[PDB]
Amino acid sequence: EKFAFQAEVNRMMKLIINSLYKNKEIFLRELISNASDALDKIRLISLTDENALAGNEELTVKIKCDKEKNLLHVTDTGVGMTREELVKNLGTIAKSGTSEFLNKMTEASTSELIGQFGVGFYSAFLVADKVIVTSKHNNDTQHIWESDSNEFSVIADPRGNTLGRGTTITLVLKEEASDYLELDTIKNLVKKYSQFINFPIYVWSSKKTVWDWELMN
Numbered sequence: 001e002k003f004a005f006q007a008e009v010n011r012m013m014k015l016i017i018n019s020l021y022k023n024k025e026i027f028l029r030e031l032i033s034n035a036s037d038a039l040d041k042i043r044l045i046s047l048t049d050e051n052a053l054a055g056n057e058e059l060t061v062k063i064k065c066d067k068e069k070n071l072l073h074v075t076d077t078g079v080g081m082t083r084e085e086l087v088k089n090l091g092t093i094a095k096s097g098t099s100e101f102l103n104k105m106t107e108a109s110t111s112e113l114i115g116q117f118g119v120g121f122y123s124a125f126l127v128a129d130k131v132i133v134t135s136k137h138n139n140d141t142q143h144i145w146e147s148d149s150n151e152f153s154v155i156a157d158p159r160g161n162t163l164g165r166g167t168t169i170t171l172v173l174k175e176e177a178s179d180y181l182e183l184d185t186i187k188n189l190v191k192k193y194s195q196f197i198n199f200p201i202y203v204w205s206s207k208k209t210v211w212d213w214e215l216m217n
């Protein structure tokens with residue numbers, strides 16, 4: 001249940017890190033944008049079958065900081081991923097045109113190259129020592145994908161179905177990336193990266209203080 005990344009994905013990872021170490025916050029743009037895509041897919045699926053929305057009726061992105069645990073969570077109620085999809089889409093295969101989307105990277109700002117080829121997930125390793133993807137798809141049981149980028153593993157989630165339908169990306173942050181645990185930093189970055197997203201985006205925030213979802217767009 002442990003897997004080597006494919007070679008071009010290794011190169012893509014290294015390329016994305018060396019390109020973007022200057023602009024780490026880009027990871028958040030990409031995760032938000034990828035969450036939006038997932039929501040789009042399940043909304044499209046719901047056109048012809050709205051049993052599609054049964055496990056979870058809402059279409060949202062919900063972002064949560066755990067400063068004490070050094071975690072950042074990005075959760076969408078999109079289409080989710082099957083176990084098989086986690087293995088194929090997140091490492092073992094590359095999309096057509098990968099086998100050098102990589103020239104264009106080097107040659108001829110890679111900020112939009114990544115967003116354009118839909119490969120921004122890997123910018124998560126800019127700010128994170130570990131990335132965990134917990135995902136629930138209508139056609140499968142909830143699974144966990146985990147990676148420090150030197151391999152990955154996929155397991156059935158022992159907790160069962162807690163997402164309903166969708167995906168959480170959990171980042172174990174690097175020391176270099178500790179500012180991304182701060183609420184005002186994340187809020188200000190989610191506001192900026194979500195103004196053109198059509199799904200509502202929440203940050204778990206504080207306001208006798210109480211916590212709750214704060215809408216960011």
Ligand SMILES: COC(=O)c1c(O)cc(O)c(Cl)c1CCc1nccn1Cc1ccc(Cl)o1
Nearest residue numbers: 031034035038080081089093094095119121167
């Ligand atoms: C179906 O996508 C997702 O459930 C999802 C999500 O909800 C939030 C996210 O931040 C990300 Cl990264 C994802 C997955 C992104 C993705 N889905 C299929 C492929 N990929 C990324 C990818 C890059 C190269 C190849 Cl092959 O696949």
